[PDB]
Design a protein around this ligand. Structure first.
Ligand SMILES: [Mg+2]
Ligand SMILES: [Mg+2]
Ligand SMILES: [Mg+2]
Ligand SMILES: [Mg+2]
Ligand SMILES: [Mg+2]
Ligand SMILES: [Mg+2]
Length: 185
RNA sequence: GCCGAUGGUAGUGUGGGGU
RNA sequence: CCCCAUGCGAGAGUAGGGAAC
């Protein structure tokens, strides 16, 4: 899934003025470029709600140029729920680190035994070329027995995608019942 | 658990203005 | 305190680097 968004450059125009004018200040960069830009907040909110930091957002620049990007950061004005600044990591020719969602599948054999399944991670940090960005990484936990742990090194990675975290990183585990992470009593 | 921008923000110097 | 103008500018995070592959 890929998205589009119109971006415009900026120089002297003050951030507070831009925000006031319904625009969101921000900037795009990579080992090659760095340029101050801005985008309409409503457009962004609409787009980011679908792309987040997992899908490529194509920025339509004034110079008719288009840049494939990934949202790297969104500074929220403290004391509210609203973006005050955003970073766009411009995808290039080299691989990049990024967060891919994990899609857990299957019921742990240890869960059939009354065990408790715990998904420690929701997303995983992997390294990959913009060409091979995966939509999600499926994770089958049907094998987990009470007291087991699926580690990053256990994840079945797509061709081109590799771990950007320690192989020993715990992705999931199945723990024994009778309270095993506090008990609402 | 190293170095580290730019951008934005907090804070702030000076001048002016204003609930 | 807020805004405008003008000069600085963190902390935390990101790019990039170091290290590693
Ligand atoms: Mg002071
Ligand atoms: Mg700065
Ligand atoms: Mg800093
Ligand atoms: Mg790094
Ligand atoms: Mg090797
Ligand atoms: Mg490397």
């Amino acid at each position: 899934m890929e998205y589009r968004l119109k971006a415009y450059y900026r120089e002297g125009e003050k951030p507070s003025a831009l925000r006031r004018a319904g625009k969101l200040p921000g900037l795009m960069y990579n080992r090659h470029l760095n340029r101050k830009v801005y985008v309409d907040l409503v457009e962004f909110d609409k787009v980011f709600r679908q792309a987040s930091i997992h899908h490529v957002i194509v920025l339509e620049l004034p110079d008719g140029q288009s840049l494939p990007t990934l949202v790297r950061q969104v500074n929220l004005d403290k004391r509210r729920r609203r973006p005050e600044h955003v970073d766009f990591f411009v995808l290039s020719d080299e691989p990049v680190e990024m967060y891919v969602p994990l899609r857990f599948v299957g019921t742990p054999a240890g869960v059939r035994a009354g065990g408790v399944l715990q998904e420690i991670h929701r997303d995983i940090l992997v390294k990959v070329s913009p060409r091979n960005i995966p939509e999600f990484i499926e994770v089958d936990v049907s094998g987990l027995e009470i007291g087991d742990s699926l580690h990053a090194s256990d994840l079945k990675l797509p061709p081109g995608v590799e771990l950007a975290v320690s192989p020993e990183e715990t992705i999931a585990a199945v723990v024994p019942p009778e309270d095993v992470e506090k008990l609402a009593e």
